[PDB]
Amino acid sequence: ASLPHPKIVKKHTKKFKRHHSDRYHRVAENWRKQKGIDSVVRRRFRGNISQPKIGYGSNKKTKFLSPSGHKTFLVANVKDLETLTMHTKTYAAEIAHNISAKNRVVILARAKALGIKVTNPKGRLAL
């Protein structure tokens, strides 16, 4: 039920990773800019890893847009689900990981009755 929107395009789908993160275990995969004077990445030599810049910004119209075309909204209870009544065509319901299955099934039933898309319907459900 997503509104007609421009095709989702991503300039850089690959996740940016820190230099030598695979080489050394103490270096986490979280990106950190290299400030060394003789840093190859900072000097931007040919054949290096990509550096995050202002050019990689996604389209504003498609910003925070899921592939299904519905924005993700975190839901905590029935009252929180009520927030997505008159905006269901442009939003999606997501259930927090702190929610027990007993209340999860009630929230799922409420969303089904109210016509609200659920990001993770099969969460903490018996299978």
Partner 1 sequence: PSRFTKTRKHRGHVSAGKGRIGKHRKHPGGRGMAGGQHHHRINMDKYHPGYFGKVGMRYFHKQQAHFWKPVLNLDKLWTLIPEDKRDQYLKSASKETAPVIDTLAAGYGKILGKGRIPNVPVIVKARFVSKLAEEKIRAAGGVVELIA
Partner RNA sequence: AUUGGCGAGAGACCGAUAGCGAACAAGUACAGUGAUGGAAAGAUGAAAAGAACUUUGAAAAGAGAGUGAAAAAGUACGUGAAAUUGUUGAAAGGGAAGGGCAUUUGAUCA
Partner RNA sequence: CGGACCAAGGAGUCUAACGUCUAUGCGAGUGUUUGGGUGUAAAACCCAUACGCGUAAUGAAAGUGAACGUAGGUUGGGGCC
> What are the tokens at 1?
């039920």
Task: Give the residue, chosen from 5, 33, 44, 87, that forms a contact with partner 1 under the rule CB under 8 A.
Answer: 33
Task: Give the residue, chosen from 4, 6, 55, 67, that forms a contact with RNA under the rule CB under 7 A.
Answer: 67
Residue written as token pair 């898309």: 117
> What are the tokens at 47?
């054949």
Task: Say which entry of RNA, partner 1, none residue 49 contacts (CB below 5 to 8 A, set by partner kind).
Answer: RNA
Task: Say which entry of partner 1, RNA, none residue 15 contacts (CB below 5 to 8 A, set by partner kind).
Answer: none
- Name the residue nearer to RNA (CB basis): 51 or 83: 51
Provide, rounded to whole angstroms, the least separation between the CB of residue 59 and partner 1.
30
Nearest one of 114, 127, 67 to 93, comparing CA atoms? 114
The answer to whether the beta carbons of residues 17 and 31 sit under 8 Å apart is: yes
DSSP state string for 53-99: -GGGPPPSTTTT--TTS-EEEEE-SHHHHHTTSTTGGGEEEEE-TT-
Task: Give the residue, chosen from 20, 32, 43, 89, that forms a contact with partner 1 under the rule CB under 8 A.
Answer: 32
- Name the residue nearer to partner 1 (CB basis): 17 or 71: 17
Q: Which stretches of the chain bind RNA, using CB under 7 A?
A: 14, 17, 22-27, 47-50, 67
